[model samples]
Target: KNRPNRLIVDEAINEDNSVVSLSQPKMDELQLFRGDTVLLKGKKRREAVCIVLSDDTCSDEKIRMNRVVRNNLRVRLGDVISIQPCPDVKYGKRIHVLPIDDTVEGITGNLFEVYLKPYFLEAYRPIRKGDIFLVRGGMRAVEFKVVETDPSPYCIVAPDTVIHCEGE
Candidate 1:
């Protein structure tokens, strides 16, 4: 029934960090649909959730994504990773994220307004505990970690998910 499937990692061109591309046939075999959220398991038991998309250009044995997703999974290109359907992920009531200390050294202005707000505004991105994401604003990119979630782990950041921020 529900099980993890192994897929070779591939690089995505001009893709969003929140998205992953899988071949149509592979998606068919996995029973995955466009815009479906899926959980990916990687090295050392790390996990991340991302929205799936069908890519005709992708190979059946490969999954495509950007840098952020790969880093979250702690896997490199041409490596093997597993994908599982996340049917149980719920809408987040709230989530707390904080900037990486090194990334905030020279940053200015209110972090939320300049970076966080625009990055997540109306974007129902999936966030997982301990995952780090980069948001670029004002000519500099800022990286933040998913410190905590309402349910204490994974959730789709919905319209009502209160995004809490800390650390200057």
Candidate 2:
């Protein structure tokens, strides 16, 4: 296979290079997003941006490795991508968050519509209005009570961990 054994950039890494690795407590404290970049080398050379969706501890159940982009809003089901970790203000004080860039080529429609999933309604069922959800799937958004869950043709399984919603 011709996948460059490793990407060796000719340019030297600048002092401004953003690299981070959150300890378990830090990970829990931050409630990382889907595209935050981090550095990890204690046990392995996983020095790439984080694919938060693939972080098993993110939720109790194993959500699929679905999107891959600097923003999860970009790619489809099974692509590869990474993101740089920034601040927490991006979630906003109290509003629905949509990560997809509507201006992009392939996707069209309200940004919110593209990111909404049937599973979210039920997945975030216990959430209250204005509460913040620190999840890893895509941009963090609210799931109001009006949204309904479709149970017709889905698999039933146990949740490894129940959703944890912390309030002010």
Candidate 3:
């Protein structure tokens, strides 16, 4: 008999955005490999996409959600979250960026290219709509807000794209 990979379990919040950690056994049972994107469903039908990581520290078959996931779902520690395989997402061309913090205006660069390369990649995980994530702009760090994307849900940030400011 075959078992389904989907499971509803508690969640642990991690500040890291690189990925979410799951138990090794869980990963094996789900036939999921590391760095694979997984779908996380929380209360109120909130959903998020995250990269998977194997962690021994997590127990009771719990999936650890990163800060982005928690914030999107409006969940707290010990909150019940479900996990399943995430389907392929269509990368959008246009990405709207906002400088939520006043400091973002200070540290100067192309904003879209130099500052976003390290964190945003062509084939990287999708950011949640209306989510704010911090980015390093030169020596100073600032919070760059993702206002909206053309395709919705999932997308890649590029330098050539015209990034719209919140006020303008």
Candidate 4:
């Protein structure tokens, strides 16, 4: 049952939603349900984990990717890619951050700092160092880098967690 589907990648620029949208028919064909985990693979061999969402805006052969997915896959608009079902990943507590831009400042060690929460109700997600994360409650897309994490392989992220970053 490891079949892959080739679909065009469309950008879903709503907010900090790490999800992929497919048409209802497409979802049925792929045997995918809402919140099902899928792995998106791009031309450069880059991939990102995504939660499924069904929508009418999605075409029969297109997958709408959010900002995080697009950035992780390193893909542009209308890029053709493949997707398949994947297992869920576990993210433990504690993640380190490095701001690629100057939008954020004054973050110190061992103190709880507020970070962006995803569209889902859950407070945390799995992340790795050097990965990009968006800031919550902002008009513009505020992205930050994961400099280090308490857990080496994966880190659990939440709204109020200390993210170590360099001060300006």
The numbered model that scores best in lDDT is 1
- How do these models rank on lDDT, best leading? 1, 3, 4, 2
How well is each residue in 25-49 modelled by candidate 1, as lDDT tens digits?
9999999999899999999889999
Estimate TM-scores for all models.
0.92, 0.21, 0.71, 0.68
- How would you encode candidate 3's per-residue C-alpha lDDT over 14-48 as one tens digit per residue? 55664678788888888789877777777788766
Pairs of residues clashing in candidate 3 = none
Candidate 1, position 166, lDDT: 86
How much does each candidate deviate from the true structure in C-alpha RMSD? 2.5, 16.4, 4.4, 4.6
Which consecutive 10 residues in model 4 have the weakest lDDT in total? 111-120
lDDT of 1 at 151: 77
Whose TM-score is higher: candidate 3's or candidate 4's?
3
- Model 3 lDDT at residue 48: 69
lDDT of 3: 0.65
| For model 1, the run of ten residues with the poorest summed lDDT | 100-109
In model 1, where do residues sit more than 4 Å from their true spots? 1-4, 103-105
Superior by lDDT: candidate 2 or candidate 3: 3
Q: For candidate 4, report its TM-score.
A: 0.68
lDDT of each: 0.87, 0.26, 0.65, 0.64
Q: Which candidate number has the best TM-score?
A: 1
